[PDB]
Structures are given as structure tokens and as C-alpha cells.
Amino acid sequence: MHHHHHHRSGDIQVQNNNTCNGKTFDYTYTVTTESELQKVLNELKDYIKKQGCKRSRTSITARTKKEAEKFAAILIKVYAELGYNDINVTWDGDTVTVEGQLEGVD
């Protein structure tokens, strides 16, 4: 394993923006494997738990709708362990950002 920080887009960039004190607590990992994704999310979960995270948004690279299903599902589990509630799945078109829960307008 080397994996130099390249701009060659194709890898799974997991970027967590959490509100606690600031983005100084960011949890950004760049993997190329679903197993490595599961590993870094399980650990990212431990961080959100440790800090006084009122709410956090983890953004996972998912350019196709297929990826917007599979990578998002793993992340809904991560949030469901930190809070055993209904979890929101929001995908813009290139990245799935999971934060809060959708209400009213569904």
C-alpha cells in the first residue's frame, strides 16, 4: 500500500464535517476498497461518539445511483449505531451526504 494523495478522481473520498467547536475535528479518509470504507467508517463512528457532536454530516463519493445505494446504506448503519433512529439519505449527484432526518415535505 502507498496510495499518494492524487487528484485522479475515482477513489471513495469520505469527508466528515461535524459541529462541536469547528471543522478542526474533520474526519477525511480516501480509500479505493469497500472493506477499507467499512474500516474507516467504523472508526469515524468512534470519533463522533467521543466528541460532543450535536450533529455531523459524512460525505461519501458515489457518482452512480448504484454507489448511492450501497455506500449510503453502510453510512445509515454508522448513524443508526450512534442514534437508533430513522436516518436521512441525501445524494446531490456525485456524493452522498447523510445529516439529520427528512420531515414534512417527503
How was this structure determined? It was done by: NMR
Contact 89, 98 (CB under 8 A): yes
3-state secondary structure of 29: strand
Domain 1-106 class in CATH: alpha beta
Annotated domain spans of the chain: 1-106
Chain breaks in the chain (C to N over 2.5 A) after: none
Span between the terminal Cα atoms of the chain, in Å: 43
Residue 55: C-alpha distances to residues 26, 64, 99, 106 (Å): 13, 27, 7, 21
Spatial distance between the Cα atoms of 23 and 43, rounded to a whole number of angstroms: 18
